[PDB]
Amino acid sequence: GARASVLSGGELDKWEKIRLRPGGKKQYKLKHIVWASRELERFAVNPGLLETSEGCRQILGQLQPSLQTGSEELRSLYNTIAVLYCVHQRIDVKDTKEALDKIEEEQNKSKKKAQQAAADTGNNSQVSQNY
Numbered sequence: 803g804a805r806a807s808v809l810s811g812g813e814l815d816k817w818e819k820i821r822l823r824p825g826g827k828k829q830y831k832l833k834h835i836v837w838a839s840r841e842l843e844r845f846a847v848n849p850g851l852l853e854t855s856e857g858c859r860q861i862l863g864q865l866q867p868s869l870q871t872g873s874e875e876l877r878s879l880y881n882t883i884a885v886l887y888c889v890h891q892r893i894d895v896k897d898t899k900e901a902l903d904k905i906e907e908e909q910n911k912s913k914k915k916a917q918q919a920a921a922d923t924g925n926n927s928q929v930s931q932n933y
């Protein structure tokens with residue numbers, strides 16, 4: 803029926819190791835995986851995505867633009883969803899601050915690719931018309 807598997811044996815060890823903040827005094831715990839699970843379903847997002855390398859990539863997409871005007875809750879999410887994500891992408895980090903950059907820089911490339919051809923506005927061009 804319902805199969806639960808967020809962090810396997812290996813992901814578990816690394817998880818407990820990773821910290822929420824760079825200059826904090828506490829590491830990651832299940833409390834963060836569950837807390838985000840109950841908060842996800844609230845945003846019309848099933849908690850099953852937390853155990854999917856693809857889901858995280860999506861969940862972060864909605865929080866990315868939200869970070870601008872997000873609250874304490876919205877922030878904590880991007881943090882957890884960030885670490886858990888890197889774990890599913892065969893990525894290794896020490897804290898959330900680092901993992902976050904890995905997710906931001908990874909997307910920065912997509913922008914350069916989807917914003918390289920549309921950057922030559924200047925002299926008048928040619929085009930048909932019927933006026």
Ligand SMILES: CCCCCCCC(=O)OC[C@H](COP(=O)(O)OCC[N+](C)(C)C)OC(=O)CCCCCCC
Nearest residue numbers: 841842844845846847861862864865868876879880883
């Ligand atoms: C009882 C109140 C319900 C009001 C109506 C439902 C609102 C809702 O679904 O909010 C989530 C939000 C996008 O929602 P909307 O902005 O209402 O979408 C409008 C357009 N349609 C309906 C076509 C999809 O997108 C987000 O998830 C952004 C918030 C960050 C959370 C990300 C997951 C952690």
